[PDB]
């Protein structure tokens, strides 16, 4: 996260660290959506252009974390992957359309003060909150700037941006399964996600039931916190049918 702040203890209890076994390194962010299911971006596991193709045994998910590097004894839980499920129509060839993946845990993770699942929106949650100008929250252990690493989980609140401004910011072909967020140059304020933040969640707090919903997933952008550029996020509601399908049948 660029131009964000240190999160508070337990401010993002759904926050998941995708961790690489050997060499031990951060792979990506992710979110906890039940005691057995974790959500992230498909590119965190599959990205042929870079020779990225991880399977279950290549990694661990680390939940309840706050500090990036430390092993948070008696706080985090480290879970093993039983199975990875990547969106069949995920488009890594052109524009990362449908950048989303599900990961099933081998055993259930126990909830606690620091570990809790976020909600997924339904049609009305989406429609009532996916509005230009409404701010969401993005959290992550990624790069502090485009071109070091933070000691603790970082957070930034960013306004959702109108579709045409999103399109007019980039040469890339934008789909219905994405949205962009970030301040305009003229708004003065700053902030974006960056490398290492990938797969983490974009959440919003509904003013109706006061619950946090994950509306987006960190997926891509041109540089980080670049003037006139915006972060692009996977539209989680637009792909809800697929999340239910996978949950339903496995």
């Amino acid at each position: 996260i660029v131009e964000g702040s240190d999160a508070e203890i337990g401010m993002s209890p759904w926050q998941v660290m995708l961790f690489r076994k050997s060499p031990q390194e951060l792979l990506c962010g992710a979110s906890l959506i039940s005691d057995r299911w974790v959500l992230t971006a498909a590119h965190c596991l599959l990205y042929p252009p870079w020779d990225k193709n991880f399977t279950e045994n290549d990694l661990l998910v680390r939940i309840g974390k706050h500090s990036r590097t430390r092993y948070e004894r008696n706080i985090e839980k480290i879970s093993m992957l039983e199975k990875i499920y990547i969106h069949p129509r995920y488009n890594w060839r052109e524009n990362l359309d449908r950048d989303i993946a599900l990961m099933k845990l081998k055993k259930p993770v126990a909830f606690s003060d620091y570990i809790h699942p976020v909600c997924l929106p339904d049609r009305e949650t989406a429609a009532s909150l996916l509005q230009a100008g409404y701010k969401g929250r993005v959290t992550g252990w990624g790069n502090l700037k485009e071109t070091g690493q933070p000691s603790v989980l970082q957070v930034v609140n960013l306004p959702i941006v109108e579709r045409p401004v999103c399109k007019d910011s980039t040469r890339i072909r934008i789909t219905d399964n994405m949205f962009c967020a970030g301040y305009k140059p003229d708004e003065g304020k700053r902030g974006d996600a960056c490398e290492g933040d990938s797969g983490g969640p974009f959440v919003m707090k509904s003013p109706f039931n006061n619950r946090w919903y994950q509306m987006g997933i960190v997926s891509w952008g041109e540089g980080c916190d670049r003037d006139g550029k915006y972060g692009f996020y996977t539209h989680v509601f637009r792909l809800k049918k697929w999340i239910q399908k996978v949950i339903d049948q496995f």
Partner: peptide, 10 residues
């Protein structure tokens, strides 16, 4: 730099 995690996590 990442701190070693317990062995049972492999």
């Amino acid at each position: 730099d990442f701190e070693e995690i317990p062995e049972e996590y492999l």
